Amino acid sequence: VTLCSPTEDDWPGMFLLAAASFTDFIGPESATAWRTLVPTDGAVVVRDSEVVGMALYMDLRLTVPGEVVLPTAGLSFVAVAPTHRRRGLLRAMCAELHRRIADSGYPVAALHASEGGIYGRFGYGPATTLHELTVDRRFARFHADAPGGGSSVRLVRPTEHRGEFEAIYERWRQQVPGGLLRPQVLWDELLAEAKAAPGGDRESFALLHPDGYALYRVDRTDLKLARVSELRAVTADAHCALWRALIGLDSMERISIITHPQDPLPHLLTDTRLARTTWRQDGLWLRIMNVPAALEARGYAHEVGEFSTVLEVSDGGRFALKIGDGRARCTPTDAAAEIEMDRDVLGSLYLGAHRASTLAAANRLRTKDSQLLRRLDAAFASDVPVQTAFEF
Amino acid sequence: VTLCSPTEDDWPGMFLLAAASFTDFIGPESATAWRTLVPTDGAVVVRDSEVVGMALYMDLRLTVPGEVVLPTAGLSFVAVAPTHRRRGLLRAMCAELHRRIADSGYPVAALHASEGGIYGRFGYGPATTLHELTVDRRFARFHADAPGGGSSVRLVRPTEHRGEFEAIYERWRQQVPGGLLRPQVLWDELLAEAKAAPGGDRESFALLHPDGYALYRVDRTDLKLARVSELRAVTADAHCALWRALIGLDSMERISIITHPQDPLPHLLTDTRLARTTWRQDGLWLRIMNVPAALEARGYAHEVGEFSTVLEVSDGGRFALKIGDGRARCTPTDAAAEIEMDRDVLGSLYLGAHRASTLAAANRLRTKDSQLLRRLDAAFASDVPVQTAFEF
Amino acid sequence: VTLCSPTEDDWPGMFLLAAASFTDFIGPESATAWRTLVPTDGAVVVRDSEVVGMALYMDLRLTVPGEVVLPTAGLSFVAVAPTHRRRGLLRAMCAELHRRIADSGYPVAALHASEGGIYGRFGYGPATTLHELTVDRRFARFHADAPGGGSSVRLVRPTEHRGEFEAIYERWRQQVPGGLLRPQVLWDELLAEAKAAPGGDRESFALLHPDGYALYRVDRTDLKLARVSELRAVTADAHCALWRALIGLDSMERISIITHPQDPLPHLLTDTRLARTTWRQDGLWLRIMNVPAALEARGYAHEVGEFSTVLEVSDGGRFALKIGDGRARCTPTDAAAEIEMDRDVLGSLYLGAHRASTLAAANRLRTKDSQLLRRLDAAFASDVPVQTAFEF
Amino acid sequence: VTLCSPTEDDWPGMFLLAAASFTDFIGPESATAWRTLVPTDGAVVVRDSEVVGMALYMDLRLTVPGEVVLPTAGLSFVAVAPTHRRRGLLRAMCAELHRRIADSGYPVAALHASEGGIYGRFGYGPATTLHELTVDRRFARFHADAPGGGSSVRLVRPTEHRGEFEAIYERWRQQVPGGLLRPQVLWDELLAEAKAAPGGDRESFALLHPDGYALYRVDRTDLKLARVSELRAVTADAHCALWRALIGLDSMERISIITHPQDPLPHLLTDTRLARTTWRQDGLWLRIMNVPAALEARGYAHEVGEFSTVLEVSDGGRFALKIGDGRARCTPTDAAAEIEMDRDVLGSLYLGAHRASTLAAANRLRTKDSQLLRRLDAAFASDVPVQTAFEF
Amino acid sequence: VTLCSPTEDDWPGMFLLAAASFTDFIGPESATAWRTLVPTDGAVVVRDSEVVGMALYMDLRLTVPGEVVLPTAGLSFVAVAPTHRRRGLLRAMCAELHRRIADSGYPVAALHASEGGIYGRFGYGPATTLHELTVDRRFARFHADAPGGGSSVRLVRPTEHRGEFEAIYERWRQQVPGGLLRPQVLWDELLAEAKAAPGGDRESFALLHPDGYALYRVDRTDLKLARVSELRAVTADAHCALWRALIGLDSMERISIITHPQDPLPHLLTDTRLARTTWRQDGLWLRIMNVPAALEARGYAHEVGEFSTVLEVSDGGRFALKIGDGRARCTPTDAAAEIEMDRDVLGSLYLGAHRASTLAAANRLRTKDSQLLRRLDAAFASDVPVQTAFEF
Numbered sequence A, B, C, D, E: 001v002t003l004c005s006p007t008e009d010d011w012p013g014m015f016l017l018a019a020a021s022f023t024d025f026i027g028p029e030s031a032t033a034w035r036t037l038v039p040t041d042g043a044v045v046v047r048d049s050e051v052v053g054m055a056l057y058m059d060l061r062l063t064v065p066g067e068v069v070l071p072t073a074g075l076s077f078v079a080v081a082p083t084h085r086r087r088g089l090l091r092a093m094c095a096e097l098h099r100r101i102a103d104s105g106y107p108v109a110a111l112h113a114s115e116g117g118i119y120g121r122f123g124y125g126p127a128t129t130l131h132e133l134t135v136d137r138r139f140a141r142f143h144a145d146a147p148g149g150g151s152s153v154r155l156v157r158p159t160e161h162r163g164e165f166e167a168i169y170e171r172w173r174q175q176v177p178g179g180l181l182r183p184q185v186l187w188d189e190l191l192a193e194a195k196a197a198p199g200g201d202r203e204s205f206a207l208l209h210p211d212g213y214a215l216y217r218v219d220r221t222d223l224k225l226a227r228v229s230e231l232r233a234v235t236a237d238a239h240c241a242l243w244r245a246l247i248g249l250d251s252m253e254r255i256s257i258i259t260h261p262q263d264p265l266p267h268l269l270t271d272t273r274l275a276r277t278t279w280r281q282d283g284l285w286l287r288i289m290n291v292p293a294a295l296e297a298r299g300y301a302h303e304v305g306e307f308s309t310v311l312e313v314s315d316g317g318r319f320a321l322k323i324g325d326g327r328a329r330c331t332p333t334d335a336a337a338e339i340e341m342d343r344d345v346l347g348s349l350y351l352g353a354h355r356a357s358t359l360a361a362a363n364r365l366r367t368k369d370s371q372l373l374r375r376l377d378a379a380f381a382s383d384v385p386v387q388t389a390f391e392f
């Protein structure tokens, strides 16, 4: 069992492992496209010679609070053959990729987790939260105060308006923490999933506004449910207008969307309760590779005074942290630590999705100063609510 | 159809309406106990003479941010006979009770809503959020960092340790926004629901720590599910210890609790995802009766500079609002309004459960200043997370 | 295995057989009340000595078309021990009771069937049809044309208004084909089933109009469903008013009732489809004991000319049948038969629930004259639609 | 928003709206075939320019009581974009098509309704009733009296016996109220739905008798259920023989068919209850365009004396109606009305599916004469029971 | 209705009957391959001329206790048209095939039964038992004593390792009672079912050991269930190693397999209960064609002394049976019978799947000697447990 970068001959063996490992495996055509986002030496394989282990990272651009875009290593296609479990192959592959990511100069790594129990021990913390809202649209009445009391929204074929979706998404991802650049190969892939599959998914439709879109399809088996796969809105007007159109799908009983906890949809209706939360789960996970680089890169709340502390990350360094005027300075120190946490915990705070005082309550984050806790809570909070871009 | 305070002879007619109106009706014995919390002239009935309409308020004590306790009118037992719908009887009864509540000097009214669509139009906004967490306890492993790595928790009969529950609850309700004083009649009622009912609920058990308790019972029909009816913990140690004991119910597959969005339980486990959010709903609703009295009574975040604005409440007054040093001064003015909202919206902000920028996004809250929005968000936020005490 | 009238000592043995035979067995207290409607020598038992077989008839009064009331033998409590199946005990018991019923001078016998396959061979035909309608009351809007565009309907406790229900029911049963006299013991029984049972059925409520009532209860397990056990209305106004009140049960999603195919409820709503037919089954079964007596006793449609034919009932006699002016004369003859049918078929036509041309289509009813078929269809039809009174 | 006849360039835009509006949309190939039944100027579209609104009628031939065939405008493909709801586009499109249908000389219009609440207000009433019967065929034994006590029925491939199905259907539709001419394009379409679809419906089989056929297929997901899509039988022998063959599908637990309330199948079995009614819904809806033309065109029951009355249709004319010898004469008058009804109510009576006395009971039909009610009931009744041909 | 061997022209008619008779019909391509295993005059058809009846046998090789391979007539493709039920066509076809099978010199016939009630009366008895085990693999821990405490198992594409599966299966079928030779056409068919079907089954994967394989696929609809279609293991090591790999499918909740009652999997786990038996059914059915030939051909338990008896088979002959040294001698006699049974009962004993004392308890097997019963039980038992090869 040696650990190597895969040659062109290794990829059929990797696709076999993928097929047997991932029930949602996108198949070798789509896999070969996503592959274009993997840099030279971005992938590792373990051979026995068939492929019994693999992992790779993609070059991503992640928006963080203060509309700052970070180079991000996006982990994906991680798999150990069922024949080689509990043999330390994951530990080995994760260690080599983290070495390579660190040496390449990425301040953060990110992934989507298949189980919530695997990734904490490698320094990844859940950084965004997925909310499923299901609206019973038969009772849905808009509030007097809701914007848009002619319709600016058009029902369209997704493939005929690619440029407009690209332009809107590009605006969206640049101003939203959790936003990812979507390169051209992923627009190629997204608009191929929009066509109907014989015995599979139904045709996708689009609702297009100047400042937003929604892609939706009727569910395979429940023909009274519309699944909104993606709603990107750059103004409140766009968001409301798109939801007026979705509530107008009179052949449907229910509209479902995977969104964020701060989605304003419930407040657009006369009955907040009609927008039921049917599902909640961790979205994007972050590993802070370089603590000082990441802490200095993001903006902080202007609505908190200048304050200084010493942060210790468990086997990750000790740092003098000074926050003021929505900037941070983060420098080496051996001064006594005022706040202790494992690396994963820092990942979870980084995008504002979790409160420091909540992680303190579970003792994932030790300090003896209540005042420092409130200051961290306020400073790390994001004015624009954190959202999840797309699964990778 | 006249509107009157009920005499002793009206209560059998009110109990009939209750039985036919509420599927969870507690019956006339329990109803007669809850009645002791209704002041003279706290109830109205509409006669035709049988009772075709009723509503009342109870004298409550509600903890708000800054550990301030407000006298609160608690609306309950509101019902219109199925024979007298769409006749304006609710509008009439709500108007008379609000007159009486206002004249009596209550700064706020509160209720639990049977539908999320009825109460917005009378100035009530949802002020607390209920989270159901279901733990699959077979996979539940505690984190290395979790407190309590002898057990201080005892399995006990609820009725044998009333004083200890009273003392712990009394500590809890005084330091938690959403907390209500539980008077002696409601402890009498709570510990009567703890006994098993032939063909009904199973026996309730208690887990008792010096600084917390949990009351739980096995579900009637699902015999692999324990329902935690109530967990009150005054320290993180108490909270963790009680959850160690609950995960130790080895005859159960699942533990379910109705808690708050900031419950730290997910962070105590090695897998955050095991604590699934299975249900989410509005808890307590607030009507701010006297805007200046309520705004001045609660504490605000110390972690935001002094700032001034003009708040207009739709048909509720215009006010110069100055917030600094976690206090507010709220005085009459005719100066141009910088922030507009309906009364219900103010109720929803009041306990910190909803962000101003989220209600702005739905246009329930109009301002032309982004900076004022961020300041409101930060100032109205609560360091202690808002919880729900008990249904009334 | 001898066949005898039971002595007082046989009834405990009969109650044992009942308990083991009928899952809905009403128990020995209620059974002892229903027993008061069984005449001397109205019951048979087969002993082996334990009771291995039993059957009895009750003295009933059945309304038939033209508001004519017939003495009717009501078969009930029919059971063969599981230890004595396929031994001809049913055939024996049915033969002895039919002999006794015939000799006593009953023109018709009736029963409610436990299986639809047992009773055809003894000359019983299904004579009334049960429709379950379920209304989703959240979408229910009344039509502009619906009567009742003060409410005359009261929500009441059933036991406090017995006289009013008796008076309304008595009016109803006298003018409706399928109507049965409800004696005092069955009002005693009906109003005892109105109280709540610990671990059983919930409390029954009543909606009372001068010319109608509805008894309803919430379902044990589905707490969003109200089951209307009984709705008796003597005017269209009463029927509509009661349904306005039932649609006003705002805590319910669904109202269900067991009614008749000609219930006008669907036509009272702006959407006929909201009143879904969820269940359909045979109600009352008739055995015509004396063909000429029964045919002469009921009224016929005035809206068909005088016509004559010869009816043969298979091993039941041949008769010259003359119908005109809504009366029939039915006399012995040996003239060639124009219409042939088994006895059960006659039972099925007798109350107007089934069309002759439909039974002809299945060849349960042979004739070589299409014109005679249309005449029978029209003459046997009932202007007041046939309903089912109560199960016995 | 202008209203126009569509050009060849509008149809791709109409197909987009169809796809997003109808979950059962037959697709553009099949749509282009059905299009051949739309006359010049039979379609309207609303442009904004994309298609935001459409409606059309097809040239149909509808059999009415007395085996009379009427030219019928068949409304279909009616849709308003989700972006243009509650804008009066339906009201506008329905008004223009009704103008065109009226001016073209159609006595009646018809449709199949997507919701039971949309079409009453435009003068359409439900005119036929759909019964689903499900037979548990494992218990199904035929009655001694059932016809067919060699088999004349053949199991065949539908596409190899098109001429025989055409000939049988043509005989069926000419003698059955509700019957529609099926033109050649719809036989092309029907026999293309008979082939198996990969991941879709299973292969269709045919049971062929000289005087009837049944097309059936096994359900996609329930492999113990056979769905009879269509059973056309011109004699009782044919009907029974086909059902003997269907009960002979020994690999099936259940046979289901959508039929009419007067289907004689229950009476062919020793247990009527085995043929459970599992579903009931409105079939064809009628709008009487020209009251006198329609009333004069159909035959009436010969089994009722000559009688005269004055019929008022709400904003539809007042008419002297004389019925005798199964013909009607319907002429203008200003004499006092004896019977009042909205137009939709007339549609519902027209094919005999609903009784006048039932609509009177709901006050959809006002008269002060009970005798006139019984006469209408009897005269409007159909000797051949009303059935539904095919959905359009 | 004549009975004939089918010509080449009859097969399209037979495929039609198959399609309408069998929901799992493999289609005409696969049917034409299986056809290569049918000898000249191995098939019968009944014509009316369409095919209304068919049956055939295939040339099989069945392993019986003592690793003896018997020529076996494998009945399959047996069908009577739904139009020709209860006409004695099955009785006729079964009689002609049994004549042909007997005259050809087959000692035994075998089939898989569609219903458990059809085949007893033609002398077939259930001879093997199917156990479904479902493992919840999340709790599955292997016992300290389990073999395999490098992995020898490989995850592979089935079609790339045909020779290895053939070699392993060939070893398996030769040493296991119930084993069938799998000819090349059935390997062609098996490895075509291994590819994914659009809207159908998912891709099949293989786990390959030197001395065993497992073919498995994820279920269509339950994406947390892996279905093991086939596990062939020639050593305990191979069996355990393959199950270590299957429990290693970490994306799955459950692994299901159809196996035999003596599968040792439950004993490999620390918790025997994790391997739940979810389904149990008769597998292969045997008809002993020639009693003496079959009884003499198989080996018997060496662990029972020499003993002699007289066996009578109902209308099948009387025989002197002597068993010793694991051989039997079976010769004609007219001596009084000590043991009586119908032919089907002999089929059920023949492979050791059922105990004589169990069939005696149900009186399917009469003797007056308890000692003879114990001797039969012990002698007929198989040291290698009886398994089922593949459905035909």
Ligand SMILES: N=C(N)NCCCC(=O)c1ccc(F)cc1
Pocket (backbone or CB within 6 Å): A024, A026, A030, A031, A032, A034, A035, A036, A038, A056, A058, A076, A077, A391, A392
């Ligand atoms: N999780 C999802 N539904 N889609 C993400 C697809 C990621 C993926 O398969 C992949 C495949 C090959 C690569 F080189 C990189 C990534």
Ligand SMILES: N=C(N)NCCCC(=O)c1ccc(F)cc1
Pocket (backbone or CB within 6 Å): B024, B026, B030, B031, B032, B034, B035, B036, B038, B056, B058, B076, B077, B391, B392
């Ligand atoms: N909602 C719950 N489960 N319990 C609250 C019970 C409130 C109640 O019924 C009541 C009854 C009588 C009164 F006077 C005041 C209140």
Ligand SMILES: N=C(N)NCCCC(=O)c1ccc(F)cc1
Pocket (backbone or CB within 6 Å): C024, C026, C030, C031, C032, C034, C035, C036, C038, C056, C058, C076, C077, C391, C392
């Ligand atoms: N079928 C129902 N739900 N009730 C009918 C009760 C009839 C009955 O048990 C009975 C019992 C004793 C008698 F003597 C006569 C009748």
Ligand SMILES: N=C(N)NCCCC(=O)c1ccc(F)cc1
Pocket (backbone or CB within 6 Å): D024, D026, D030, D031, D032, D034, D035, D036, D038, D056, D058, D076, D077, D391, D392
């Ligand atoms: N409702 C169904 N299942 N089939 C009816 C199809 C009707 C239809 O789509 C259509 C399409 C185009 C036209 F020009 C006319 C009609």
Ligand SMILES: N=C(N)NCCCC(=O)c1ccc(F)cc1
Pocket (backbone or CB within 6 Å): E024, E026, E030, E031, E032, E034, E035, E036, E038, E056, E058, E076, E077, E391, E392
């Ligand atoms: N029962 C299964 N799933 N497969 C067995 C297929 C047997 C079969 O169809 C067949 C078809 C044609 C023949 F000539 C012989 C056999």
Ligand SMILES: [Cl-]
Pocket (backbone or CB within 6 Å): A258, A259, A260, A387, A388, A389
């Ligand atoms: Cl999102």
Ligand SMILES: [Cl-]
Pocket (backbone or CB within 6 Å): B258, B259, B260, B387, B388, B389
């Ligand atoms: Cl809470």
Ligand SMILES: [Cl-]
Pocket (backbone or CB within 6 Å): C258, C259, C260, C387, C388, C389
């Ligand atoms: Cl009824």
Ligand SMILES: [Cl-]
Pocket (backbone or CB within 6 Å): D258, D259, D260, D387, D388, D389
């Ligand atoms: Cl039909």
Ligand SMILES: [Cl-]
Pocket (backbone or CB within 6 Å): E258, E259, E260, E387, E388, E389
């Ligand atoms: Cl097996």
